[PDB]
Nucleic acid binder design. Structure first.
Lengths: 180, 178
RNA sequence: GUAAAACAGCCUGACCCACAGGGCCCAUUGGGCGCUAGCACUCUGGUAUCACGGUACCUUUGUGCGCCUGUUUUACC
């Protein structure tokens, strides 16, 4: 459909595979030389992006104003190629949709576009012991290595998958103000 | 970098294709026109990147004397036009000191291979058939039929066979398209 | 002959000047220019299609990297 036609373009032009000490993660690039990974990635001073060594110029583990974990890392990479500016495509506040697709790009999960269904705001969650805010939840079995997955609806990036359990999957929301 | 241009080329013009005879890298040259190793011999539909597409033509390529070029040219029913890489095809065959063979298939996902010097080669008895315009590089090679053999600013040809440490690509001449 | 590094750039009377004229391209009376080597985003329009949210190619503009010639500097064949 058009959600699939959006997601495929999205991963083709803005997604990447990234390797850190903890494993393989889909990574999404937002604008200029700036991109987003799970807080859990714990990106080093170098990351293998598409098996290629790239230097990290900066890394913010993202947190709200009262200081609890948002589960996103924003990193600025030292590279000459700039990203397609998708800032028009991510929401101002968390976004509910009846239908979304999660796009995963790892050796494990090559070119994976996965229909999640309804995405609903969720807010607070004690995610493996950590109090984390602004989650979204969709209804699907999630496995390992989809952390980093891109939650999408036509013309809208809704969040980045950061964890799940059994029959529920959770994405950190992706807000406009985090950039610019 | 042959590497940086070849990744560009494979993101914007390459694809993975399934036909009744196997899985092949496919490259699209312009609009809805793309080229395949003649061996696949597309049916009325083919799976392109796992989405089934209708094929409106499939010309098996041959010189004026009628000899086999090992290339099928097919027109796909899709609204998207391919990036016009015709400016990268030489008018006729090109030798190149260092070249890369680029594959996009499930077996060989995102493969980039420095083959080295490529030399004109011409005639070849390809499994019992005489074939013209082969190009030869020295690299060990099956299931890569379809790979895109190229260098920076030059797409030169499509791999169609090999043996041991020798690999041959049907040349890609500018005049073949329109 | 090969490797790092700096200045410059359409041509016409190594640099910086100065004038004058010859040429191409523009989003023009105002400006840009080495590309047989490109890659990336970006901007003006277009063409097509779509669940009207997009997406694909065409073209154009910048900038980053990459590259090519003139000239030259250190350490080496």
């Amino acid at each position: 459909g058009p959600a699939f036609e959006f997601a495929v373009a999205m991963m083709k032009r803005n997604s990447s595979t990234v390797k850190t000490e903890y494993g393989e993660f889909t990574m999404l690039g937002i604008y200029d030389r700036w991109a987003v990974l799970p807080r859990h990635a714990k990106p080093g001073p170098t990351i293998l992006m598409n098996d290629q060594e790239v230097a990290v110029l900066a890394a913010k583990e993202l947190a709200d104003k009262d200081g609890t974990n948002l589960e996103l890392t924003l990193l600025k990479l030292n590279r000459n190629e700039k990203f397609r500016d998708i800032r028009g495509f991510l929401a101002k506040e968390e976004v509910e949709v009846n239908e979304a697709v999660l796009a995963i790009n790892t050796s494990k999960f090559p070119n994976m576009y996965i229909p999640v269904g309804q995405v609903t705001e969720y807010g607070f969650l004690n995610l493996g012991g950590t109090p984390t805010k602004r989650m979204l939840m969709y209804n699907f079995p999630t496995r390992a290595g989809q952390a980093g997955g891109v939650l999408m609806s036509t013309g809208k990036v809704l969040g980045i998958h950061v964890g799940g359990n059994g029959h529920q999957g959770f994405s950190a929301a992706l807000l406009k103000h985090y950039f610019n």
